[PDB]
Design a protein around this nucleic acid. Structure first.
Ligand code: K
Ligand code: K
Ligand code: K
Ligand code: K
Ligand code: K
Ligand code: K
Ligand code: K
Ligand code: K
Ligand code: K
Ligand code: K
Ligand code: MG
Ligand code: MG
Ligand code: MG
Ligand code: MG
Ligand code: MG
Ligand code: MG
Ligand code: MG
Ligand code: MG
Ligand code: MG
Ligand code: MG
Ligand code: MG
Ligand code: MG
Ligand code: MG
Ligand code: MG
Ligand code: MG
Ligand code: MG
Ligand code: MG
Ligand code: MG
Ligand code: ZN
Lengths: 94, 134, 135, 38, 176
RNA sequence: CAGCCAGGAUGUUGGCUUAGAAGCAGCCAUCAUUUAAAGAAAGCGUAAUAGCUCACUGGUCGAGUCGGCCUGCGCGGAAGA
RNA sequence: GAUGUCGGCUCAUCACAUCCUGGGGCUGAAGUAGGUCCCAAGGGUAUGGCUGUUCGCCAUUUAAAGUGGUACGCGAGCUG
């Protein structure tokens, strides 16, 4: 039942990623299968609240990007070194 | 008002009974005459603490109390001593017949709907002393 | 008081202490005390905090120390002017933000929080209470 | 009166109050618990 | 806020007069006037005063709550008044009222003469009791506090001047 | 939520110990109970009981209330010729 | 191409982290007498024996015999 709304990233790299996290979003990547990887931006507060549930890391999530729905599983998460924040997430296509 | 566990047969020994109720204001002689007539039919050596509703000028009248339960458990056990920590060492488990005989003492002065419930209250002190049922 | 049983060399350059820590996850227990600041932790401090923690939990559960004082620190004695490096006097662990310093298991979370607060009161660096995460 | 940098409730009857820019602890049950930050 | 919400009823025989911020209350027990804080708007309405905040004031609701409490105390004061009772505890401690001066003997080498304010009266039923009466709650509280201050109750025998409804905790002198 | 109103009883002064320990020095059992409800009891207090009252259960009162997280600016911590 | 030293004497001036005196909170504060903390710098704050001493010990006082800064105040003021 986990649904996450995402945007396609229009800029990549250190500066753009830091600007995202200063604007209270964070970057993430969807890869796997035969499709090309998709780099996305997520809303930090909503996703941070969702990932508190243990089922976030075991269930099949749905990421809505540009209207299309993609079934994924959380694969890796980079956390802030000491704040309760998220830096990045890997999603693998399910 | 100084209260102590008064004996039923002995009247006016200075240490244990003098300040028990003779110093309260109760006529100790008349109390240990009327309650003594009661304890003449009561069994030998049963300390039964009644609730005192008395005066201070040699006038008295008393209410009755149920005879206790913890005194009568050590008869068939053969030991007149207690354990520092029960459920580890016991004075010898006793019979449900003796436990029900003890419960018979506190059966005629209760308002419970079902009388079978209070079989656990009597064994509360049984477990607190070392008398575990079979 | 932790200190290496033996070392290749007696004395070490001062160096510096930049960067973020490695070892930022509760890896052995369920709860952790994590550094938020940057600094040095002396062996005496590590041991004072360990004592405080352990007495708070009444020696129940399990406690891990994730840091070890492997850097020797020299001092020059009083009233000395050069003339070679001073003498090793104590040992420290370098701490960067994010470093999990202690972990606990086998106790309730409230008790772990209390024990860790008592411990953090012995340390020269700001810290925060963390819990194990599944990923 | 205790005068400390750290003033805290010491029992369920202690109350924190700020008077004239000063944090104080006032206790209905125990005079030993009276504190003022300073 | 919640205190300011509740309006205060004006009983029959009590006349209120609102002139901007100045409020005057007249009753069978006396006349009391108060200048309200500038953040408070008070409406007479229909035999019931209501209190609210004026626009542009950050503490308007707090000021309105205090204004409501004060006006309610004013109404009670002009209708039924306020009474305070003090007791003297200790051998030789005595009180007596003459006109509007309370004479206290409290173990000092000099007598105590306390002059009452304009609108406070005192009676001494017994030699160890003082009863104050007045229309101003704050004033009667101040007078009672001043009388108690001469000999505040002490913690080993409770001796001194105490409020009648005051719990005076005692303690025993340290052993040895 | 806060406020105000009622009870906290039966075994039982549980047992040990002590000159006495009674819920309230300490130690072990720490479970029932009628029931709307009561921890063999939170301190105070008694030489010790009595007493005090918390936990504990609701009756009124009619709109918000509680405390964690992050974050901006401020407060105390702050004594010298 | 010189900024005279330790101690004493004479004369001081400031700070307050207060020795006395003033005001207060807590006390394991009965009283008398103390302990500890807060406020407070107005004024006050030993003479002798020993030693070059500062210091210190000792005798005997006092409400008390404060702690520091001032080129470890002060030798174009004295001593030496
Ligand atoms: K809410
Ligand atoms: K000076
Ligand atoms: K003084
Ligand atoms: K004092
Ligand atoms: K002065
Ligand atoms: K010397
Ligand atoms: K000089
Ligand atoms: K000279
Ligand atoms: K000169
Ligand atoms: K000269
Ligand atoms: Mg750059
Ligand atoms: Mg380098
Ligand atoms: Mg490194
Ligand atoms: Mg003031
Ligand atoms: Mg600051
Ligand atoms: Mg300031
Ligand atoms: Mg020259
Ligand atoms: Mg000062
Ligand atoms: Mg004084
Ligand atoms: Mg001066
Ligand atoms: Mg001045
Ligand atoms: Mg003057
Ligand atoms: Mg001579
Ligand atoms: Mg000489
Ligand atoms: Mg000099
Ligand atoms: Mg000087
Ligand atoms: Mg000169
Ligand atoms: Mg010479
Ligand atoms: Zn308190």
């Amino acid at each position: 039942m986990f649904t996450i709304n995402a945007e396609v990233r229009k800029e990549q790299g250190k500066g753009a990623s830091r600007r995202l996290r200063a604007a209270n979003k964070f970057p993430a990547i969807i890869y796997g299968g035969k499709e090309a990887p998709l780099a996305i931006e997520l809303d930090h507060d909503k996703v941070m609240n969702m990932q508190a549930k243990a089922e976030f890391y075991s269930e099949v999530l749905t990421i809505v990007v540009d209207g299309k729905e993609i079934k994924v599983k959380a694969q890796d998460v980079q956390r802030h070194p000491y704040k309760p924040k998220l830096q990045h997430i890997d999603f693998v296509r399910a | 008002y100084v209260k102590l566990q008064v004996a039923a047969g002995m009247a006016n020994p200075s240490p244990p009974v003098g300040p028990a109720l003779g110093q309260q204001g109760v006529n100790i002689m008349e109390f240990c005459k009327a309650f003594n007539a009661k304890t003449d039919s009561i069994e030998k050596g049963l300390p039964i603490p009644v609730v005192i509703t008395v005066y201070a000028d040699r006038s008295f009248t008393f209410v009755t109390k149920t005879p206790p339960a913890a005194v009568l458990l050590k008869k068939a056990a053969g030991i007149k001593s207690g354990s520092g920590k029960p459920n580890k060492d016991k004075v010898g488990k006793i019979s449900r017949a003796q436990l029900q005989e003890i419960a018979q003492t506190k059966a005629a002065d209760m308002t419970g709907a079902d009388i079978e419930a209070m079989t656990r209250s009597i064994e509360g002190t049984a477990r607190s002393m070392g008398l575990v049922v079979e | 008081m932790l200190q290496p049983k033996r070392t290749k060399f007696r004395k070490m350059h001062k160096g510096r202490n930049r960067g973020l820590a490695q070892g930022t996850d509760v890896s052995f227990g369920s709860f952790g005390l994590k550094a938020v600041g940057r600094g040095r932790l002396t062996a005496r401090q590590i041991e004072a905090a360990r004592r405080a923690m352990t007495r708070a939990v009444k020696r129940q559960g399990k406690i891990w120390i994730r840091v070890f004082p492997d850097k020797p620190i020299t001092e020059k004695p009083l009233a000395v002017r050069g003339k070679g490096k001073g003498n090793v006097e104590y040992w420290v662990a370098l701490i960067q933000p994010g470093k999990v310093l202690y972990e606990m298991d086998g106790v309730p979370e409230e008790l772990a929080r209390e024990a860790f607060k008592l411990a953090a009161a012995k340390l020269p660096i700001k810290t925060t209470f963390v819990t194990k995460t599944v990923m | 009166m205790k005068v400390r940098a750290s003033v805290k409730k010491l029992c369920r009857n202690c109350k924190i109050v700020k008077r004239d820019g000063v944090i104080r602890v006032i206790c209905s049950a125990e005079p030993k618990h009276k504190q003022r930050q300073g | 806020s919640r205190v300011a919400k509740a309006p205060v009823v004006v009983p029959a025989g009590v006349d209120v007069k609102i002139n901007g911020q100045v409020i005057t209350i007249k009753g069978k027990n006396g006349e009391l006037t108060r200048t309200l804080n500038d953040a408070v708007e008070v409406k007479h309405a229909d035999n019931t005063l209501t209190f609210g905040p004026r626009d542009g004031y950050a503490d308007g609701w707090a000021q309105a709550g205090t204004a409501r409490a004060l006006l309610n105390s004013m109404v009670i004061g002009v209708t039924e008044g306020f009474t305070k009772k003090l007791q003297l505890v200790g051998v030789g401690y005595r009180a007596a009222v003459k006109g509007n001066v309370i004479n206290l003997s409290l173990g000092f080498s000099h007598p105590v003469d306390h002059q009452l304010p304009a609108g406070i009266t005192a009676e001494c039923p017994t030699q160890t009791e003082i009863v104050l009466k007045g229309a101003d709650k704050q004033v009667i509280g101040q007078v009672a506090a001043d009388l108690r201050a001469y000999r505040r109750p002490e913690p080993y025998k409770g001796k001194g001047v105490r409020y009648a409804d005051e719990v005076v905790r005692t303690k025993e002198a340290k052993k040895k």
